[PDB]
Design a protein around this ligand. Structure first.
Ligand SMILES: *[C@@H]1O[C@H](CO)[C@@H](O[C@@H]2O[C@H](CO)[C@@H](O)[C@H](O)[C@H]2NC(C)=O)[C@H](O)[C@H]1NC(C)=O
Lengths: 50, 50
């Protein structure tokens, strides 16, 4: 409880931002793994920074 | 050969059921204890099943 009291402003701001963005808390679809990038073992030295 | 056939037929119901029962009541004990919240019903169920 003291830990949550300490982080009260940041957790309130986070809750407001998540509510406005309309995201789902937690991680349903636990059975999800990211796809392997196309030609992954030989496609790593490619610049993708905006 | 007849003995093997009979015992494999019997082992298809008296051995394949052993993981079950154990599995089911382990999941239900976890749910009752609070270790499995409503957001982790399927997750823990399929973890125990696998
Ligand atoms: C849980 O999984 C189900 C089953 O795939 C998802 O339901 C599908 O949702 C998509 C996207 O809206 C629909 O096009 C499909 O028709 C749905 N499938 C069925 C069988 O109805 C569902 O979105 C997932 N739920 C969460 C909360 O992640």
């Amino acid at each position: 409880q003291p830990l949550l009291k300490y982080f009260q402003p940041v957790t309130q701001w986070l809750q407001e931002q998540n509510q406005q963005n309309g995201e789902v808390l937690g991680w349903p679809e636990y059975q999800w793994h990211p796809p392997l990038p196309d030609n992954y073992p030989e496609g790593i030295d490619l610049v993708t920074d905006e | 050969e007849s003995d093997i056939n009979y015992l494999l037929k019997m082992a298809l119901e008296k051995i394949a059921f052993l993981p079950f029962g154990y599995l089911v009541d382990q999941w239900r004990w976890g749910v009752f204890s609070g270790r499995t919240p409503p957001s982790r019903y399927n997750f823990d169920w399929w973890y125990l099943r696998t």
